[PDB]
């Protein structure tokens, strides 16, 4: 069976571990041919790749959109040919999911990573009283946001502060800006914050993902401000190493392996005419499979590395 898969950007670091896990699953299954494509962060690039995949007779499509709003376009191309589409990681509109009977989504509940990240910061702030540099009881922080409009970026930006507040901890946002899920852009942005007027007031660096966290970690050691706690989201192998050295204070596992497994399992099922979850233990709720995030810090780190 031929399954065509598009990854919105191959050098997105979390999409790179998903991509690779998708490939290992496809190679262990002797009756499947996966046709992998890098959309290069361009939705028209992706749109033309879905035409070639359909021209090639694929039986199911697993699509990681560059734009969440291109879902309708992708469904209309798949529909003419009655082909299943499993959208994964960037969530389409509920109404776009509902417009096609064979459209499914594999993701996470975005909200939950922001809540867990807020609980990590609350636990380590209570425990590390010296992180309150100006001794006022409030967290003065900077936030590195992902793509504006992206469901994960927006929920993680909102729910980390809501959770801290809910856990009794008042916050003061010194600065927030997007570095668009990227290491080098977050390095620049942190360097700039550390070269500006409130470099001395920054107590906590909160980032919506690990690639950006790692960028802030190297702007922060360049200014020898290696003592500022940095939190991220995803539990990338490289970030677990920093959590281990203490250069980062915590992460949230974004489970690349089971989301890649669920995408593979539903796309092959649907490609073979079976029910989306047949023979699987995936719980599909309203065409959606949501995999859980897990909080990770020095105390439960041995479960991850
Ligand atoms: O859409 C891609 C993005 O999805 C998020 O869930 C991850 O945390 C990001 O690091 C990733 O780049
Ligand atoms: Ca403070």
From Swiss-Prot:
Single biological process term from Gene Ontology: chemotaxis
Gene Ontology terms: cellular component: outer membrane-bounded periplasmic space
Binding site for beta-D-glucose: 12, 89, 150, 152, 156, 209, 234, 254
GO terms for MF: carbohydrate binding; metal ion binding
Record key words, sorted: Calcium, Chemotaxis, Metal-binding, Periplasm, Signal, Sugar transport, Transport
Entry note about domains: The calcium-binding site is structurally similar to that of EF-hand proteins, but is in two parts, with the last calcium ligand provided by Glu-203.
Physiological role: Part of the ABC transporter complex MglABC involved in galactose/methyl galactoside import. In addition, binds D-galactose and D-glucose and plays a role in the chemotaxis towards these two sugars by interacting with the Trg chemoreceptor.
Name this protein carries in UniProt: D-galactose/methyl-galactoside binding periplasmic protein MglB
Gene that this sequence comes from: mglB
């Amino acid at each position: 069976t031929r399954i065509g898969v598009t990854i919105y950007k191959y050098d997105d670091n979390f999409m790179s571990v998903v991509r690779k896990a998708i490939e290992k699953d496809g190679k262990s299954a002797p009756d499947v041919q996966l046709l992998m494509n890098d959309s290069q962060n361009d939705q028209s690039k992706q749109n033309d790749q879905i035409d070639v995949l359909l021209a090639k007779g694929v039986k199911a499509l697993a699509i990681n959109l560059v734009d969440p709003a291109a879902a309708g376009t992708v469904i209309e191309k798949a529909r003419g040919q009655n082909v299943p589409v499993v959208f994964f990681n960037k969530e389409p509109s509920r109404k776009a999911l509902d417009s096609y009977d064979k459209a499914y989504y594999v993701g996470t509940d975005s909200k939950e990573s922001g809540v867990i990240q807020g609980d990590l910061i609350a636990k380590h702030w209570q425990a590390n009283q010296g992180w309150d540099l100006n001794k006022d009881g409030k967290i003065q922080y900077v936030l590195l946001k992902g793509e504006p409009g992206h469901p994960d970026a927006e929920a993680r930006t909102t729910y980390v502060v809501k959770e801290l507040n809910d856990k009794g901890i008042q916050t003061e946002q010194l600065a927030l800006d997007t570095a668009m899920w990227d290491t080098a852009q977050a390095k620049d942005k942190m360097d700039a914050w550390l070269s500006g007027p409130n470099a001395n007031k920054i107590e906590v660096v909160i980032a919506n993902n690990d690639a950006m966290a790692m960028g802030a970690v190297e702007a922060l050691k360049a200014h020898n401000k290696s003592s500022i706690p940095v939190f991220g989201v995803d539990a990338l192998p490289e970030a677990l190493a920093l959590v281990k050295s203490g250069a980062m204070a915590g992460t949230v596992l974004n489970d690349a392996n089971n989301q890649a497994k669920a995408t593979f399992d539903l796309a092959k099922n649907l490609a073979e005419g079976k029910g989306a979850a047949d023979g699987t233990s995936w719980k599909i709720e309203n065409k959606i499979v949501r995999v859980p995030y897990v909080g990770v810090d020095k105390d439960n780190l041995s479960e991850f590395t």
